[PDB]
Paper text:
In this study, we describe the structural and functional characterization of [name] [name] (XaCas2) of a subtype I-C [name]-Cas system and provide experimental evidence of pH-dependent conformational switching involving a hinge-bending motion during activation of the dsDNA nuclease function. Overall, the structural features of XaCas2 were similar to those of other subtype I-C [name] structures, including the protomer fold, the dimer interface, and the conformational state. Together, the functional and structural analyses indicate that XaCas2 is a metal- and pH-dependent non-specific dsDNA nuclease, and support the hypothesis that subtype I-C [name] proteins undergo a pH-dependent conformational change to allow metal-binding prior to catalysis.
The crystal structures of XaCas2 were determined to resolutions of 1.65 Å and 1.75 Å at 20 and 4 °C, respectively. Data collection and refinement statistics are summarized in Table I. The root mean square deviation (RMSD) of the Cα atomic positions between the two XaCas2 structures was only 0.07 Å, indicating that the two structures were essentially identical. In our crystal structure, XaCas2 seemed to adopt a catalytically inactive conformational state, as was also true of several other subtype I-C [name] structures evaluated previously. The crystal structure of the XaCas2 dimer exhibited structural heterogeneity in the putative hinge regions between the two protomers. As the electron densities were well defined and the B factors were relatively low, the two distinct hinge structures of XaCas2 probably represent two stable conformational states, which can be alternatively adopted via movement of the hinge region residues.
Author numbering:
A (entry chain A): 1 to 86
B (entry chain B): 1 to 11, 14 to 85
Write the structure that this text describes.
């Protein structure tokens, strides 16, 4: 299944850089970092459960947010990219 | 239809560009994170908004990604953390 993970990391508090680094590292083997703070994760349900717990644990929920969107299969979302591909 | 719009904006003039993108989306959706918008548009409205978004960003250094979330997308989104 595809889960889209959007991480809104604080810029007005310390350590946001490190937290994003750790979130990105946790997503590295199960997905693609498609924008600075957005990850497309290709996972079965158990892999998602495991990864989700790590992501929740790695952020600071007082100042960061995660949104998780269950997309079904990537082709169903008819994804479009406009602009840069760093 | 629900289109999720994720704007990856470069960190000069970027603040202004994010503000203009948010303003263009304001009547057609919800800004659910700093640079992510849940946009509810019919196809004609999407054609119009999408063109505006393309014109408002700097495609050399910014990006947009658009996702069609489908019906009953509300049952398939989880929020964790600050709001």
């Amino acid at each position: 299944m595809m889960v889209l993970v959007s991480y809104d990391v604080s810029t007005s508090s310390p350590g946001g850089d490190k937290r994003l680094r750790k979130v990105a590292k946790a997503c590295r083997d199960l997905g693609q970092r498609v924008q600075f703070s957005v990850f497309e994760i290709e996972v079965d349900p158990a892999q998602w459960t495991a990864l989700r717990q790590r992501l929740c644990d790695l952020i600071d929920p007082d100042i960061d947010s995660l949104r998780f969107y269950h997309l079904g299969a990537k082709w169903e979302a008819r994804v479009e990219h406009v602009g840069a591909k760093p």
